[PDB]
Design a protein around this ligand. Structure first.
Ligand SMILES: [Mg+2]
Ligand SMILES: [Mg+2]
Ligand SMILES: [Mg+2]
Ligand SMILES: [Mg+2]
Ligand SMILES: [Mg+2]
Ligand SMILES: [Mg+2]
Lengths: 196, 17, 196, 196, 17, 17
């Protein structure tokens, strides 16, 4: 079979990959690395008016996650950005101009969900690139489907990316997994080739 | 002054998940 | 022995489980998922008046963790809620009404502790369910002991849960592991069967 | 070769170690455990004036990380403290007086970095111990080099620590990996033997 | 009052990484 | 205005751990 040394090697390398943001690819949409949401170019946030923050017994305001959370690595149930219905979009100014080669979308696992369902997850989606920051018409980079029966983190590689570069990318959600009120986005990542 | 604590209460059901 | 494919399979599944909040069970006490502490129904917080926050050289206030931290997934030394002495309690409004089937309690590991001791950890505890939100007398669901010599995360399944459902649960700490001043609670989780 | 039981054992123990702050050693420089930066004894923070925070369309201030972040466990690209040039220093009041036996320095991985380079990482560094809190002359504990080609987390054990104890430690960065503008520090840890 | 949201925009290039 | 920084100092020993 396998030697003990081979087992240690397999385990070490699997934990290395796990530690590298799970997938081992630089994320040009990570906010701490220099990416940001373009607030006016995102869907309206679905607000429930339920999470009330108070201080000294004084009600202050209701807390809802803004689109910024999709560019942050804190994926736990409820740490997601929600928009109303099954169609929505977010636009991100990447940390650098890149040739985009892949995107990653993740959702919470079924095992951490009541009744093992994730109907608020995005389903069909499309990625668009915008040449400059204030331009109206994007270029389609690819169309993909987040599989509710797949792994929580799903990476999608473009079949044949052109040589075009972009610093502005749109995540366009076309359908969801059936939730009748909203769609929840946990984390979106963009991968590719920077200047060198 | 007194140690402040931000209190979070759910008053209208579940947040989006 | 085992094949290389079998090793990869074992490793993959262990990392899957690790990624699912370590234990692969939905947590109805997680604050981001919709749970909250009932502040007036918790023990007084032990305050040390040591962690002083300042701005522009102006002392502002002392920072202590409130009971909310036991419903958050950020377990590192000192990220715990403390009450005075070895007896205390916290009451949580769960995110949904459930038939409770298990609870999880975790503490920091001995390996991350000075002198390899965790004397502030809870020891004997009891779980109570409350039928409605403002009711005086809880129903005992079970009594358990957090083992200081066990794994940091310990899940306890009720032997024979009734069909009763609850949205309010009390964690009642009866003893600690010997700390003479306080008991520290890092994270408490509640698992069970929601409506479907 | 190896048995299935041996594989499960190897995997279990590797994940245990991973869960214990990756290295299984108590960190006397962790802020939540009681450590703090001595602000007046650190290099000036390099500020870029780029991360603008706004509210209701009103620009508030620019966000930069202070030295406190090196005592926090949130290592993601950009969650680092930066000083200008390749020489700098930070002084930490440890959570307890210890005989220091090792330090740990970590940086982000090449796999999460544009062009697979980490030129802002510290290179040569030195650790000094200070007998009391307001004393001018430190005692050299050791000199080490963070290897840009090594693992992201690197622990360095002192060859022969004396019986001296310290509660104040300086991390002195002597060179970096070539970045022409700044050096970035992600997380610094101090390990050793407390009183018992 | 209205749900506040702190907005973060990068206006002068990359932060230190 | 000037970049604010919240400073944390331990002035009365260890926090609960
Ligand atoms: Mg619509
Ligand atoms: Mg099915
Ligand atoms: Mg008492
Ligand atoms: Mg023993
Ligand atoms: Mg200099
Ligand atoms: Mg080389």
């Amino acid at each position: 079979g396998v030697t003990e040394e081979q087992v240690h090697h397999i385990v070490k390398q699997a934990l290395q990959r796990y530690s590298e943001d799970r997938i081992g690819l630089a994320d040009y949409a990570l906010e701490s690395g220099g990416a940001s949401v373009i607030s006016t170019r995102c869907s309206e946030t679905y607000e429930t008016k339920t999470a009330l923050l108070s201080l000294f017994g004084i009600p202050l305001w209701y807390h809802s996650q803004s689109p910024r959370v999709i560019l942050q690595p804190d994926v736990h149930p409820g740490n997601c950005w929600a928009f109303q219905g099954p169609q929505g979009f977010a636009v991100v100014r990447l940390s650098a101009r890149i040739r985009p080669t892949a995107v990653t979308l993740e959702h919470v696992p079924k095992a951490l969900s009541p009744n093992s369902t994730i109907s608020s997850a995005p389903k069909d989606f499309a990625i668009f690139g915008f040449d400059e920051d204030l331009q109206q018409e994007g270029t389609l980079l690819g169309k993909f489907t987040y599989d509710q029966d797949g792994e929580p983190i799903q990476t999608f590689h473009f079949q044949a990316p052109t040589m075009a570069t972009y610093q502005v990318v749109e995540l366009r959600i076309l359908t969801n997994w059936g939730h009748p009120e909203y769609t929840c986005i946990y984390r979106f990542r963009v991968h590719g080739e920077p200047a060198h | 002054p007194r140690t402040p604590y931000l209190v979070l209460s759910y008053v209208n059901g579940l947040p989006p998940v």
